[PDB]
């Protein structure tokens, strides 16, 4: 009966799958940014704009792949704490067949 | 005992999740691809190179983009998998639950 455990550990699976869910969306509003400032970039490029002109938008466009990449590193962290509740969710499961 | 179910499910889940962990870093090695890619931008920008050849590079980095974006979506979609999965494994100990 106290095997309650995995309806709890379901419980947080559920919601931070969700949050990965979430997660993703803002991962692809992040790289949706990115698509606007490199087509600018083209235009910037296709004008002869400056140097100036150029590496200031270059400079805001690497600072926005850290930022991707930062989101993404802490969305594999979750998603690890999510393999780690599954890896206990089908230990309880097998302590509970084990049962006549 | 049916709810065998449970169990099967969980092998899912745990094999999909870490299909979603290889998904990720295989997207860390594609944004990786774009902090190469934009820091030879950023060169060609200081040397003062032609058109064609930013041209060239940029058109690359949005290709890139582009095959980055179609991956987080696809990783999207199985964590909507996994998602389903949770819920269905939640249904089966809530009716579990419902026993004397």
Redesign the interface.
């Known amino acids: 009966t106290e095997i309650r455990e ?2 709890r550990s ?2 947080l ?2 919601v931070l ?2 949050f ?2 979430a997660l ?2 803002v ?2 509003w992040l ?2 940014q ?2 606007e400032l ?1 087509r600018e ?2 235009r910037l ?2 004008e ?1 704009s400056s ?1 100036e002109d ?2 200031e938008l ?1 400079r805001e ?2 600072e926005l ?1 850290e930022n ?2 930062y989101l ?2 802490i ?2 962290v979750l ?2 704490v ?2 780690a509740l ?2 206990t ?2 230990y309880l ?2 302590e509970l ?1 084990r049962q006549d």
Do not use: H, N
């Open positions: 995995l309806e379901l419980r699976q559920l799958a969700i990965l869910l993703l969306i991962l692809l790289l949706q990115l698509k490199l970039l083209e490029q296709r002869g140097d150029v590496r270059l466009i690497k792949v991707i990449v993404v590193i969305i594999m998603v690890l999510i393999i599954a890896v969710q089908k499961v097998e067949k």
